[PDB]
Design a binder for these strands. Sequence first.
RNA 1: UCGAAUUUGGGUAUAGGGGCGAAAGACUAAUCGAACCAUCUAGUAGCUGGUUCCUGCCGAAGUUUCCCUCAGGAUAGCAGAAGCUCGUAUCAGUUUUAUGAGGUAAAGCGAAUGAUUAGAGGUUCCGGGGUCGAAAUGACCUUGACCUAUUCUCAAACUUUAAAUAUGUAAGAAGUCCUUGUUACUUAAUUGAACGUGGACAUUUGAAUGAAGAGCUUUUAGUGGGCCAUUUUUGGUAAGCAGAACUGGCGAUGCGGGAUGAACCGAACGUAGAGUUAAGGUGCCGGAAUACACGCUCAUCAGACACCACAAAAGGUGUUAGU
RNA 2: GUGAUUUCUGCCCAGUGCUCUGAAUGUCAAAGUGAAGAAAUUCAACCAAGCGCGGGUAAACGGCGGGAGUACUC
RNA 3: GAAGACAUUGUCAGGUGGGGAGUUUGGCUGGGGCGGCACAUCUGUUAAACGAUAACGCAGAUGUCCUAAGGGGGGCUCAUGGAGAACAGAAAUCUCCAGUAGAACAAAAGGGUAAAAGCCCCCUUGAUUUUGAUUUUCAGUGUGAAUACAAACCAUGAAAGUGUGGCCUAUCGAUCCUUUAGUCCCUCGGAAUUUGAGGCUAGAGGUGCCAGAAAAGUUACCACAGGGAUAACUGGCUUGUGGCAGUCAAGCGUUCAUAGCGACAUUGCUUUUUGAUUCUUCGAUGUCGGCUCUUCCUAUCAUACCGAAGCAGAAUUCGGUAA
RNA 4: GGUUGCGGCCAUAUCUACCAGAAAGCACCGUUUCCCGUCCGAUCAACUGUAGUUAAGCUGGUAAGAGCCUGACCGAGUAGUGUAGUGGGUGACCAUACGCGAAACUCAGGUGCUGCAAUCU
RNA 5: GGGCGUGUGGCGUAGUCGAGCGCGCUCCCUUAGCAUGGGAGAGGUCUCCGGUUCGAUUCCGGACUCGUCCGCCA
RNA 6: GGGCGUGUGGCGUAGUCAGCGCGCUCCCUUAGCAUGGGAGAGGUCUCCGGUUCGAUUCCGGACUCGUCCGCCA
Lengths: 218, 58, 103, 142, 159
Amino acid sequence: ARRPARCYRYQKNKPYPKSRYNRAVPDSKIRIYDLGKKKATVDEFPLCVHLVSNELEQLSSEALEAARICANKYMTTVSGRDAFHLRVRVHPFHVLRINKMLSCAGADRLQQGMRGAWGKPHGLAARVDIGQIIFSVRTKDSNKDVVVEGLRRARYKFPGQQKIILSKKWGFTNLDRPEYLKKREAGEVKDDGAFVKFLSKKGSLENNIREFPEYFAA
Amino acid sequence: AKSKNHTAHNQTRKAHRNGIKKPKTYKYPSLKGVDPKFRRNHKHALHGTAKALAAAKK
Amino acid sequence: VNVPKTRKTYCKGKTCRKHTQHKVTQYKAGKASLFAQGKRRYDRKQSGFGGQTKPVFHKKAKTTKKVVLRLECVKCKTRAQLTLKRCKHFELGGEKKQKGQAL
Amino acid sequence: SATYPMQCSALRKNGFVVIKSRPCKIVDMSTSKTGKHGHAKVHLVAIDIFTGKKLEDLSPSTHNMEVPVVKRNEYQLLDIDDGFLSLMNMDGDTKDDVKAPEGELGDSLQTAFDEGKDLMVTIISAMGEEAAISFKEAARTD
Amino acid sequence: GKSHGYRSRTRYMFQRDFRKHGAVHLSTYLKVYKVGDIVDIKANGSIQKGMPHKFYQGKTGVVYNVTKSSVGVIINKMVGNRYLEKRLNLRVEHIKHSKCRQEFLERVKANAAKRAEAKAQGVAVQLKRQPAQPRESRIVSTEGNVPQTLAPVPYETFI
RNA sequence: UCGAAUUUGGGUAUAGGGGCGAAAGACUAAUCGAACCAUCUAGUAGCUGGUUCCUGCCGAAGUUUCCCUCAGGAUAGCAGAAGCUCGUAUCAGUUUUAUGAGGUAAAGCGAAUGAUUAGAGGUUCCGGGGUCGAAAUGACCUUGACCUAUUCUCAAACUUUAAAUAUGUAAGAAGUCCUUGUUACUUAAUUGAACGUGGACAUUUGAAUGAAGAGCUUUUAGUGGGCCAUUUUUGGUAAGCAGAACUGGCGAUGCGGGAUGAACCGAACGUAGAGUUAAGGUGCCGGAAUACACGCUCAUCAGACACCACAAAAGGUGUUAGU
RNA sequence: GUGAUUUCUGCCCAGUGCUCUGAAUGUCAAAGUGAAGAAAUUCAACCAAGCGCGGGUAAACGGCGGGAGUACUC
RNA sequence: GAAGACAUUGUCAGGUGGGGAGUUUGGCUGGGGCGGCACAUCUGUUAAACGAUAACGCAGAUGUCCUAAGGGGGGCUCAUGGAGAACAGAAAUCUCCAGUAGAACAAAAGGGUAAAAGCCCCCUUGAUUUUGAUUUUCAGUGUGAAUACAAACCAUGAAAGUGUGGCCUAUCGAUCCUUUAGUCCCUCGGAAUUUGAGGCUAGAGGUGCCAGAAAAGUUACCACAGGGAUAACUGGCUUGUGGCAGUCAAGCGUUCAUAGCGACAUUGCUUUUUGAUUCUUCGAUGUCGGCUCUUCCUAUCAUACCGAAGCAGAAUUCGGUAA
RNA sequence: GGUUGCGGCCAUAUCUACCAGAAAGCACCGUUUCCCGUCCGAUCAACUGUAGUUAAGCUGGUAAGAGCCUGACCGAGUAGUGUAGUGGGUGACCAUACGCGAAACUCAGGUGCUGCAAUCU
RNA sequence: GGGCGUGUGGCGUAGUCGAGCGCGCUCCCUUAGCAUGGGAGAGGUCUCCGGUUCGAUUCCGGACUCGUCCGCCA
RNA sequence: GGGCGUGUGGCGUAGUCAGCGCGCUCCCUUAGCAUGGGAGAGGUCUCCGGUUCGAUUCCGGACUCGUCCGCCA
Ligand SMILES: [Zn+2]
């Protein structure tokens, strides 16, 4: 009962989010976005691999769900359920419309054609760009060959072209590997639930000393 | 039998055929819309000025 | 709406030329006289054969009328008219609105 | 104004209409196409509020019908004498102009006033004629 | 149906601005306009009386009438294939003097000063403005400025 | 069907909104849901068709507003004709300089509004579930809220910020400066406002470029179905679909090229001669190198040129070059 | 109007018509009557039939329902 | 003989009167009809940062309400949160603190507003008179709405000032006719007085199809002028839907992803389905089905030769060259 | 230079937490007969400048302070965009040519200036 | 043709992941009639078969299946 | 298909930004002719959000029935 994704592949319309002018959309099919060992610390998983688009198109929420399930299932079967952290870095906010025509014989007796042809919501999609990350996984250096294969299996569920790039960053942060290493040898990083908070030279010295004590322990 | 609703095609060409002449400006523009208390005094001021110039160059 | 029965307003009655006290009423049209020229012409045109000779209006659309206040100066008896906006309910009896009291 | 126009399709059930210069209340509405090409015609069956007679009609749907202003007002009885009720308004105004009802409503109201209940009377105004339709009893404020 | 009211499509045009709402400062009331002054029109949304229409926002005109709290301004409006003359009564919160006119008057007085001082010698005053001429010959030296060779950089991911 | 509610001759009666009808709107002289003839009558038609010699010059519109207006008119616009007042300017689909105005593209969300993923630390006179508890505004875990510092992703009807392109004004003589006349306006007041008298400043007189004359008036035709292309863009799965914005076109237009074609590329046209080219081409059709140079490809459906006359995901120790 | 014979033609007069020798001021023309006026005229009373009120009429036009319980019943 | 000043007849007046006559029975519109109002308007957006800008585009709204919810002045600060106080608790009243508006301002939405434009109190009628000018829509017509003045007369405050309805953007109506107010002015044409009538200036009674006819159907008995500007065939563009084919592989298959299948996803093809559109045809291209007859396509049911199997034989299934 | 009265621009001026303030001026402060206003002389009104106090207001300083302001060749000539091609690509879209040119980020600095009149060790 | 729902004892019919009632009738007792009542009875492969579960109407898949709904042309 | 209306105790319906009646169950009362009265038990107002001082009342979404249409080809 669902149209093929080629009818909604391209970004032909303006963004159409769920708002107080829509008020009746179907809920998204993808619901879980972070999975694997999502409660892991930052220095547990140094390596990060990205599935990144090469197209300017719309990805369906159904396709996002299918790719998430495929990559998660493959990596938990080959490497264990808590050896990786996968994060879906796109969210379906664009709403797809359909002008539903009757498929009955002699429909033109009651069709009215293209008059008042404004559509009804039937699906949700995420609008991506050139070089935008869809999937991001962080793991140890011993799981590179299985997370590349997991992303390669997940790439079949997506239209268009995607690339698998091994990032130069440490995990889900934005510093490089030696930059993060020379930062964490000092005490100016401090862990959070999954992420890490950093020290800055601004701010009040009392707060900067109750937090982050080992760097000032010089 | 629907038809074309509205367009602005060819309109700037039609205007710029013999078009976009600026209005002619003049010395001594019109005093309509100017404040009547100003004009009522301005009449007497010009009348006195004309009488003084006539008496000077009589 | 509500309008008070009296009003101090301008009177151009050639002796006042100022704000005097005025008693207000509502304007009533008064009966259409016979021997008005249009009525005589209409009766002459409607006599004989030919049926109805003038249009009769049917497609009524308004539900209200504009109210007209008849002001009457208490000194020199001169009268003025002024119209208001359209209102479904109108009254001249002054029952003033009061604020901090119950429903 | 006393009365205001409306469209036949704009009319619906339990609404007031003017039929043959009578205030009437609709009980039935039915629309049937005149011809396959043509517009539907509205058949209206209504009951006069004052007299209870049944008056019907058939007009074009686009035609405009006259509609009265009906006001229902709430009063307390003071006396029933000579077939004329005497009523008492909020803020203490009193009217005696209402004639007493002549049917089983009037009989029940007469017996209720004879045996001494405090009676709440609903009287309706439409197109310059006045009547009483129903009575209740005040459950509180005895 | 369609809607073309007097203040249609004027949402961001007649918003005030960020963090300068409230009452207007007294310089706009202390400024003095004379007949023949050239003024810019920018409406103030805080003042609802004497407002200009949305067409005249950002338009520049000439004062022709001065009244108690307002100013009469003349604008030229393109209607069809010609310009028409439009007279507007605007309160003084919606106008300010055009700075280009006072810049030109400063050029006039400095230009007359130059002509007056150089008339005592006759030194070919050359009072017209000239645009940006092509830059002439020069000698650039390498003393402490030996050239540094640059090359295109190879490609990287940078994510 | 054939002895009768039979068939039929002649005479006679009924005449056109009338007749007659065992009823079909049947018949009433090949004419009937109102006969025929003549006149009114050359009835009216916003609708279809046609509209008669040559050459020269200029040359459109399918757009604004109103209309029982939507196949039509009026009105403005576009066009022609007649000119008139002057003689290089009170010009300009252009740039520069100076100065305004704007809320789109972009960006932002550890900034307001709204949406939204994940943990962390706290708050229980201040939650809910279990377990331990006599019970407890009891305890221990868990889960929900709220707060605090973070984190992932977004907005036609969100925004602090904010372009590019378009867009207003000014670049003087109708200007600037000095002095002092008028007034019933205005000021405490010759204070100011406006218009003035007299005097000074001229060809670099106030940026560039170009001007093909500049300005003004009257009158009237046709038109008021448009369509296509690039870019922006709306509805739609889409359409040689429907609807907008700026420009250029076709209509109204031939010529060279795209084999062919209204719109594409090039270029717009008096009659000829010579030369050079545009776009496109140079094996032969076919005018012009089976030129030169470096590589790649062998297809048991090769490929061969924009608009344009289609092909995708996924693969291949085919072959080549790379990381 | 229905359409030989045979056998039957149930219920409904609220609506729309049709029909009364009923009862009688509600609607209520012209003429006529009264008042006011200087008159044109204005205002009232009175006011025929028909409407309106009250009956009849379906071999007149026509019409012939629901919800529960247990064919039945409410 | 009967009847008799009653019938009859004549003229007026009321009723009845499809028996008959005349006429009417909107427009837009992805054909028309039904539906809706995109028909007079308003807010935000589409709208592409001046202005303008379409669709039966999106989200909504209007035919009202108000003697205060208008005008002037004075005092005060709101939503919310925290901490307290008998009954009194989630919500009654009182007190303090924080509080850029997160409240309120009649209504739809968007702007604007903090010693206020909000809440409370005091006084009032400027929601008044006289005609001009200007802005929006625009033909620079009307109507509606609005802006700034002039000449009066007022309100309020100590005053500067403010006020010509509602904080701003919507909230509404020609000619003819009737009626009211003013001037108590002009005319009734042989001359006067008084009624009556007609004029001048300003309002009201209303046309919502909102620049403004007085208006029910049917036609299968039908007619005329036209239209491919416009529907019902084929053909053409598109392929949602229909049909057919792939890729990936969580699983089914005792065990085993792929012998045979194959979820969640995703890429295509076809024009033997039905839609969408309106390009051609309305001075006509013979619109069901069957019978008859020829040829073509392959996405192969059988026959020929083969490959694979969860092929022992028999039977079967999957696939290839093949029309 | 401090302070007061009236201001202009309206955070470099605001906010949070501390510290300091000679002189003068502001301020808190004392009182209810009179004018006046309140449930309440708390606000407002009036009287005294006397009985007192810098505790607060106010001013200034401090803070790897929050905010705000300025600058950068910091990001970045990046994103976006005007013009051009019989450029690439099935397409989606993307390079190049002639031009214009952001925002976030990062870093550095700053934290009221000033007009008129009066008055002050 | 397709879609969708459905299924309990001999019959009917109620069901939380923990097969009950009524009826036919099995028996016994009962009663002046115009005859009944009472007390104990049997009976399911929860349509069927797998997986799940801790065991399954109860959870899930397949098949059966009865009922529904929608479908051609001129 | 679409449009319009509908949904409230056992039952039936209304309405202001849960009500009665009729049923009931209890109790009292009454030569009655007749009974009558007083109390109870009964409703997520179809549902879910928002709006509002407050929602049956206002609104969005959803579900449930009942109707009326789907023509000329
Ligand atoms: Zn007077």
